[PDB]
Amino acid sequence: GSFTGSMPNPRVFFDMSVGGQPAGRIVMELFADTTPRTAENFRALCTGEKGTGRSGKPLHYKDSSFHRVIPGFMCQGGDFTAGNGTGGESIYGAKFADENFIKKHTGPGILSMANAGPNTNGSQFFICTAKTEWLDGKHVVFGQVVEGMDVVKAIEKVGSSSGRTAKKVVVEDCGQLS
């Protein structure tokens, strides 16, 4: 009984490297209360608890590259299936209503799922490293950034309005810290 056996505070981190050398570590905190299902979407694909599909479609975010990057605005990631929009498989399958987002981004380093319309899982997501006002609208937050701010800037400085990184960026690995 000393251990409840529950993990209401799950943690996930991604190892990002540039070119052919290590860059740093990024750790993010997921909320298992307001939006717990969203934390599972990353924790499951990252750890890969579901396993690889027998048809041949590994469910891992390892060896993935950011689709496009933009300084000040935000970095847009992509699905490991492709990132061109055609790919992007989710365990939820059918879309479901988005949970209310009572919490908002009070500062930079907040994770939010992109949603073109309401009640959309938002397979694509973006990170806001800076506070913006023109982006004021309907947004959902499912996690926050606790560390990795030193490297996050490294991805934007090499980024450009073109939306392409100057150096190659790929995740050496991904998993759940706890």
UniProtKB/Swiss-Prot annotation:
<dbReference type="GO" id="GO:0005737">
    <property type="term" value="C:cytoplasm"/>
</dbReference>
<dbReference type="GO" id="GO:0003755">
    <property type="term" value="F:peptidyl-prolyl cis-trans isomerase activity"/>
</dbReference>
<feature type="domain" description="PPIase cyclophilin-type">
    <location>
        <begin position="13"/>
        <end position="176"/>
    </location>
</feature>
<keyword id="KW-0697">Rotamase</keyword>
<keyword id="KW-0020">Allergen</keyword>
<dbReference type="GO" id="GO:0016018">
    <property type="term" value="F:cyclosporin A binding"/>
</dbReference>
<protein>
    <recommendedName>
        <fullName>Peptidyl-prolyl cis-trans isomerase</fullName>
        <ecNumber>5.2.1.8</ecNumber>
    </recommendedName>
</protein>
<dbReference type="InterPro" id="IPR020892">
    <property type="entry name" value="Cyclophilin-type_PPIase_CS"/>
</dbReference>
<keyword id="KW-0963">Cytoplasm</keyword>
<dbReference type="InterPro" id="IPR002130">
    <property type="entry name" value="Cyclophilin-type_PPIase_dom"/>
</dbReference>
<dbReference type="GO" id="GO:0005829">
    <property type="term" value="C:cytosol"/>
</dbReference>
<keyword id="KW-0143">Chaperone</keyword>
<comment type="function">
    <text>PPIases accelerate the folding of proteins. It catalyzes the cis-trans isomerization of proline imidic peptide bonds in oligopeptides.</text>
</comment>
<keyword id="KW-0413">Isomerase</keyword>
<dbReference type="GO" id="GO:0061083">
    <property type="term" value="P:regulation of protein refolding"/>
</dbReference>
<dbReference type="InterPro" id="IPR029000">
    <property type="entry name" value="Cyclophilin-like_dom_sf"/>
</dbReference>
<comment type="similarity">
    <text>Belongs to the cyclophilin-type PPIase family.</text>
</comment>
<dbReference type="GO" id="GO:0006457">
    <property type="term" value="P:protein folding"/>
</dbReference>
<dbReference type="InterPro" id="IPR024936">
    <property type="entry name" value="Cyclophilin-type_PPIase"/>
</dbReference>
<dbReference type="GO" id="GO:0005886">
    <property type="term" value="C:plasma membrane"/>
</dbReference>
<dbReference type="Pfam" id="PF00160">
    <property type="entry name" value="Pro_isomerase"/>
</dbReference>
